[PDB]
Ligand binder design. Structure first.
Ligand SMILES: *[C@@H]1O[C@H](CO)[C@@H](O[C@@H]2O[C@H](CO)[C@@H](O[C@@H]3O[C@H](CO[C@H]4O[C@H](CO)[C@@H](O)[C@H](O)[C@@H]4O)[C@@H](O)[C@H](O[C@H]4O[C@H](CO)[C@@H](O)[C@H](O)[C@@H]4O)[C@@H]3O)[C@H](O)[C@H]2NC(C)=O)[C@H](O)[C@H]1NC(C)=O
Lengths: 209, 209
């Protein structure tokens, strides 16, 4: 049995301003309807109501996820949140905690590129975005077309990796359609990161032609 | 304790024609004793001598790997190699096997890009390479300068992620210096892959300019 606790996404924390964290306990093969999941704050102040979601996955094991909304100011000023997991056949209850990452800050460089045409793909292009030299590693990426955000399912972002320096990079990939670039040939890759000043966004336009 | 058996790198398999497979055992509680990694072939034929290697990691974990050279024809013609792990305090002996993945094939698309100058730091640029729409996921990516291959640690390549199509993609980042592009302003990203005819190889250059 293993447990994971995430931090809020920069997007939710800075753009939507409704940050949440998620406690994920995995690999709970056997059943005894009572995998207790308890939230609290390191300061002792009260936590909000959380949602619960337990799903049998077809690898023989059970997954349970609980999401807790947190205060925007509370998280930025450095509160630490904690998820204690009590299982029925537990030896000891398992504790996980989360807080904003410490260390130096550094704004991401953003660069946006369009691929050329490949044989057998006249009506689509791939756009890629390189976002690099940021710290800490938490970052969201959003793509915009017609001054609106495209659904997130439409792009994929790689996991943060260390650069040869002390900063991190991710790449983001987004396939687009002729209908889109012809209607408006400008796509914006926008990084959301706390060190980006002000407004926590740095962004870059690219066009297909 | 968790064990992993990797397939040979395409580079080693198709270009150098000396493929190897690696049994990776990660032991998170280093007990006294000797972990045993023992190799065999499903056919029962002889296996070559292997290299064993151990290192206590910074976070207390023991890491044992064993690397076994394999025949090129044997691998290509679908031989199955098996790694048997024996821990001192093992309940059961762990087993892992690996074999050629034989689903559908599709060549990779390669696209190479160079960032413009970031204000201030002009003694460096970042080169990126997108390799996409390939299957299966097995791929070797390398960078070249003066028709000569640079050291692996110079680049960072992401893990095969699924495209929206059926294929996989990977990004690769290489920072270069101004000394390098002034010596010769041409860097090649080369992808080695099972399905990249005519020579298992496709590559694309890019210039800093
Ligand atoms: C039985 O089958 C189940 C699912 O059916 C498998 O469950 C998965 O198990 C893995 C590994 O335990 C889980 O992966 C973990 O995800 C964590 C974060 O969530 C991910 O997904 C959310 C999307 O909502 C993203 O926000 C986030 O970025 C992640 O993509 C990670 O934090 C964990 O990573 C940590 O440990 C890994 C090592 O595993 C490090 O490399 C990481 O850097 C980090 O330290 C981890 O990746 C996965 O979430 C589970 N799936 C689901 C659907 O919940 C069982 O593993 C499987 N059991 C067996 C034995 O095969």
């Amino acid at each position: 049995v293993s447990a994971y606790l995430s931090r809020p996404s920069p997007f939710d924390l800075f753009i939507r301003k409704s940050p949440t964290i998620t406690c994920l306990v995995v690999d709970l093969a056997p059943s005894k309807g009572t995998v207790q999941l308890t939230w609290s704050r390191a300061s002792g102040k009260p936590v909000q109501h959380s949602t619960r979601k337990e799903e049998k996955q077809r690898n023989g094991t059970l997954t349970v996820t609980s999401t807790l909304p947190v205060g925007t100011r509370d998280w930025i000023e450095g509160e630490t949140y904690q998820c204690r997991v009590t299982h029925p056949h537990l030896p000891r209850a398992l504790m996980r905690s989360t807080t904003k990452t410490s260390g130096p800050r550094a704004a991401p460089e953003v660069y946006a590129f369009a691929t050329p045409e490949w044989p057998g793909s006249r009506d689509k292009r791939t756009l890629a975005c390189l976002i690099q030299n940021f710290m800490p590693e938490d970052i969201s990426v959003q793509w915009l077309h017609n001054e609106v955000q495209l659904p997130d399912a439409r792009h994929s972002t790689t996991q943060p990796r260390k650069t040869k320096g002390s900063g991190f990079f991710v790449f983001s990939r987004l396939e687009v359609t002729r209908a889109e670039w012809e209607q408006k040939d400008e796509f914006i890759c926008r990084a959301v990161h706390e060190a980006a000043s002000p407004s926590q966004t740095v962004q870059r336009a690219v066009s297909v032609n």
